[PDB]
Design a protein around this ligand. Structure first.
Ligand SMILES: *[C@@H]1O[C@H](CO)[C@@H](O[C@@H]2O[C@H](CO)[C@@H](O[C@@H]3O[C@H](CO[C@H]4O[C@H](CO)[C@@H](O)[C@H](O)[C@@H]4O)[C@@H](O)[C@H](O[C@H]4O[C@H](CO)[C@@H](O)[C@H](O)[C@@H]4O)[C@@H]3O)[C@H](O)[C@H]2NC(C)=O)[C@H](O)[C@H]1NC(C)=O
Lengths: 179, 148, 86, 174
């Protein structure tokens, strides 16, 4: 009847406030182009029981990784960040030109749970799987901590923090005695 | 004959449906591969990525694949686009890429693709990499798709 | 004749410049709520205050939009020149 | 509620009193140009849609990109074509029996009413081929004074403007 004027007005103001919130949200995610890294410090390393697991599926190699972490996150919190995520870049090379990498662990970190992230001798339940059992004879493995976050409505960058640990490896020894 | 009503009908109808379908095709072209803009429906990703989100999609324009990234691919048993996370990489510099994959909040791999002896993701069994997400329109479009 | 004056007989029998200044006030209070929203989001440093200010501004726009303005309906010719009777 | 109702109703009444009193043959052709551009756009749109339905994508990327860039620049030239030729001029009519005379002295007419303002404008011009010169008559008025919500948009209240039109046509055509 006569509510068509109110209908046109509600379409106009609804598209107006929708346009206003969209302009606000990409001006919000526009100016934060710069990112900041994190720091990694590992005291010692422990490496044990690297064994040749002769299995029915493949004849692969199995090993365990145990280390310590000390870090800080008091300069990484942002205004539109929601979730903090971990993944471990453990890159090495084999004899068949295969650049391998195995991740270790992750945490569902919310803003306000833990002000200082430092803990010793953790054990990762994820199986460190070797592809074509060429780790027996490697001379270096390296580790570098990286992370990933999600914004409110923006893009997904990955920022790898600076810091790497390089650990050698013996020739042929099954139950590795490390200090 | 029918001049004016057929005139304005073909005008507004063809304008709306042609413009919508070919800006969709323009997004298909500009994303490199096919790569439609998709919506999330996973349940095992909810502490990491909530329900009802739009996702854009970038592709292989002069960049190789890395680790620590969402990867969307085909499920051929149901023919459904499903996204997970990458966990393992295994490459050789001659043109074949075979690696493992495993989602978040699970101790279970992405089963259904291959057997236990073979790697899960081949380089041709992939859709791409999503850069961006919209957290509000996805609930609206899945409630529109769930309406008959 | 009289066979075509049925459905096309409703133009706006109201003011013009009064609704001009009214829509100026609507866009003004919307931009004012928006600017205090993002400066209070910049000060208080979380997004839920900006959400609450935007939703409160939308609710205030609805509460200033829905009312009839009966005085304006009673006197469209208060500012417009007075129309004649057929 | 919007002005477009009284705009197109007054345009229909103007065309009705034109055909009822002045007896001239209305024509078009810019509408036929709109037919041309919309049918050609739908032609290559449906051809590209069927060609993408029958063939896979990465062997169909580049010429489809060329087609969508061609459609974008075609819509751009269509937009500037509309903004440069079809502002408000809405009708063209030609005369009867040009026995030995050149087809000139042809009039265009337009109705101007801006966004939510009480200032109606009727601008009609004609090309007269005696000196190849245009003459334009303008009306800056308002119509909504006398009648009421019942909608008395009758000829019996608007006839002096048409009287001015036909005796101006008489004193200009001698
Ligand atoms: C540990 O084992 C490695 C290999 O087994 C030996 O080789 C060096 O490793 C370091 C890193 O541990 C390398 O430094 C980085 O190299 C990157 C490219 O090199 C890659 O490819 C070679 C191919 O042989 C691999 O050997 C190597 O491990 C890498 O996988 C660069 O891209 C890096 O640059 C980064 O930092 C700079 C700032 O400095 C940024 O500007 C860049 O954008 C980028 O982020 C980095 O330079 C090094 O190049 C390797 N070679 C040599 C000769 O040193 C290590 O020697 C061994 N260590 C020990 C103690 O045994």
């Amino acid at each position: 009847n006569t509510v068509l004027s109110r209908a046109n007005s509600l379409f106009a103001f609804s598209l107006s406030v929708m346009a206003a919130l969209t302009f606000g949200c990409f001006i919000t995610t526009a100016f934060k182009d710069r990112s900041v890294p994190v720091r990694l410090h590992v005291s010692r390393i422990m490496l044990k029981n690297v064994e040749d697991f002769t299995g029915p599926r493949e004849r692969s190699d199995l090993g365990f990784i145990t280390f310590d972490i000390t870090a800080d996150l008091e300069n990484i919190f942002d205004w539109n960040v929601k979730q903090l995520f971990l993944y471990l870049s453990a890159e090495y090379s084999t004899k068949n030109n295969a650049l391998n990498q195995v991740v270790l662990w992750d945490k569902i970190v919310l803003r306000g749970d833990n002000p200082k992230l430092l803990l010793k001798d953790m054990k990762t339940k994820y199986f460190f799987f070797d592809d074509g059992n060429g780790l027996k004879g490697n001379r270096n493995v390296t580790l570098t901590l990286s992370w990933n976050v999600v914004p409110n409505a923006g893009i997904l960058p990955l920022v790898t923090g600076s810091g790497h640990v390089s650990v050698p490896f013996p020739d042929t020894y099954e139950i590795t005695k490390s200090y | 004959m029918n001049k004016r009503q057929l005139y304005y009908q073909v005008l507004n109808f063809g304008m709306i449906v042609s413009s919508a379908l070919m800006i969709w095709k323009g997004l298909m072209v500009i994303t490199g591969s096919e790569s439609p803009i998709v919506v999330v429906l996973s349940g095992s990703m909810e502490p990491a990525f909530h329900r009802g989100d739009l996702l854009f999609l970038t592709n292989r324009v002069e960049d190789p694949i890395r680790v620590g990234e969402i990867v969307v691919f085909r499920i051929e048993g149901r023919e459904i686009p499903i996204v997970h996370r990458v966990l393992k990489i295994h490459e050789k510099q001659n043109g074949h890429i075979k690696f493992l994959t495993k989602g978040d909040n699970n101790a279970v791999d992405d089963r259904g693709l291959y057997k236990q002896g073979q790697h899960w993701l081949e380089k041709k069994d992939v859709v791409g990499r999503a850069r961006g997400f919209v957290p509000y329109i996805g609930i609206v479009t899945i409630l529109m798709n769930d309406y008959p | 004749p009289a066979m075509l004056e049925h459905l096309s007989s409703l133009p706006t029998q109201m003011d013009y410049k009064g609704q001009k200044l009214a829509e100026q006030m609507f866009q003004g209070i919307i931009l004012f709520s928006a600017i205090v929203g993002f400066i209070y989001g910049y000060v208080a440093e979380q997004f839920g205050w900006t959400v609450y200010i935007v939703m409160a501004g939308f609710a205030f726009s609805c509460l200033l939009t829905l009312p009839p303005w009966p005085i304006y309906r009673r006197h469209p010719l208060k500012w417009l020149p007075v129309q004649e009777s057929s | 509620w919007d002005g477009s109702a009284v705009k197109n109703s007054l345009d229909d009444s103007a065309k009705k009193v034109l055909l009822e009193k002045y007896k001239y043959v209305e024509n078009f052709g810019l509408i036929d140009g709109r037919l041309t551009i919309c049918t050609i756009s739908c032609f290559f749109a449906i051809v590209a849609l069927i060609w993408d339905y029958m063939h896979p994508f990465p062997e169909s990327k580049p010429v489809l990109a060329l087609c969508v860039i061609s459609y974008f620049v075609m819509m751009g030239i269509l937009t500037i074509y509309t903004s440069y030729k079809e502002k408000s001029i809405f009708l063209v009519a030609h005369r009867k029996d040009p026995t030995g005379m050149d087809p000139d002295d042809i009039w265009q007419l337009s109705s101007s009413l801006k966004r939510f303002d009480d200032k109606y404008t009727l601008k009609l011009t004609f090309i007269s081929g005696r000196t190849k010169q245009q003459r334009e008559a303008e009306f800056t008025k308002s119509i909504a004074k006398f009648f009421d919500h019942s909608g008395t948009l009758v000829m019996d209240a608007y006839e002096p403007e048409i009287s001015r039109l036909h005796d101006s046509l008489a004193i200009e055509r001698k």
